Design a protein around this ligand. Structure first.
Ligand SMILES: Nc1ncnc2c1ncn2[C@@H]1CO[C@@H]2COP(=O)(O)O[C@H]3[C@@H](F)[C@H](n4cnc5c(N)ncnc54)O[C@@H]3COP(=O)(O)O[C@@H]12
Lengths: 176, 176
């Protein structure tokens, strides 16, 4: 259950800090049509690209929100930055949102390939699921998240078939 | 053993990324007398101040290294920033170094106060120790760390006595 600690790390060290300030940052970008939620991609195979635009071409980087800074554990002005993306469908802009992967999923992946970490390659999916499950239970009950955060969890068919990440996101964008 | 996953998170998500670039950033500050190692504070009571200068007055913030940026998990130009500190002894500058706490120690602290986290307040010290131990074993064997990183682990007397954080750091600064 290494996923449990990472989910709490993700909430304590990131989400509870940035989400309360997030609407304010989005408002500052819109004035001076981005959606009001942070959308978090949670691929359960724990493949996390660093370049989101390479994962789907229909996902197109737009801009950065205004940075958030804070003094953190001895680091003056530690920077929390977030990227705005446009989602294309048949060459049309179907939506705009703050979009990112959940980074700790890379930690699950890396631990699985490092011998000293003692993490089996086979357990990625299970830990990924536990991570998503733990994170969900945290955010459900979390004050910091009020209708400002959306988890997108998905398992790719993995060469069984075609998959659209942009359609996956657009679904949640539309369900609201 | 939640500490185990955090130590690997700390290495995978931070240290292995920033340490290879660290000498280059310090060289860029010195030209254009900061020590060549990143010094990581590891208080075992898991108290981590956000303002290091408030933990000891003899620790005095100086400046920031040049930022490091990279595309990370869908975030364009995620910023890794580090602070330079001066260490005073009897009103003299005794040293200058890149200094910070290890943030995950705050996650151990926060988990311990959150009911849903299932982490006893009593286990902080043990998890802190396991974190330091795991991190040590990782960095010992880690390519990314070649004489660029130093762990400072300490247990305060906790009202038994006087403690000097700045002297604690100066000791390691001098042992080299
Ligand atoms: N620049 C930094 N300076 C000082 N410390 C740093 C810095 N970067 C990471 N660290 C910590 C040291 O390694 C630990 C694990 O790193 P992680 O990326 O794998 O998971 C993180 C990550 F997912 C997420 N997160 C936190 N901040 C951001 C962010 N700005 N942008 C997007 N995501 C973020 O929250 C998690 C935990 O956050 P931390 O508690 O701070 O511990 C970190």
């Amino acid at each position: 259950n290494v996923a449990h600690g990472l989910a709490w790390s993700y909430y304590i060290g990131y989400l509870r800090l940035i989400l309360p300030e997030l609407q304010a940052r989005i408002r500052t970008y819109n004035q001076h049509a981005v959606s009001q939620r942070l959308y978090i991609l949670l691929p359960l195979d724990c493949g996390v690209p660093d370049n989101l635009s390479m994962a789907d071409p229909n996902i197109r980087f737009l801009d950065k929100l205004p940075q958030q800074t804070g003094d953190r554990a001895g680091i003056k002005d530690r920077v929390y930055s977030n990227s705005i993306y446009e989602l294309l469908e048949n060459g049309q802009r179907a939506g705009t949102c703050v979009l990112e992967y959940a980074t700790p999923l890379q930690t699950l992946f890396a631990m699985s390939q490092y011998s000293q970490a003692g993490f089996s390659r086979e357990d990625r999916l299970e830990q990924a699921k536990l991570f998503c499950r733990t994170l969900e239970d945290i955010l459900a009950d979390a004050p910091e998240s009020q209708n400002n955060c959306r988890l997108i969890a998905y398992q790719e068919p993995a060469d069984d078939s075609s998959f659209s990440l942009s359609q996956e996101v657009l679904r949640h964008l539309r369900q609201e």
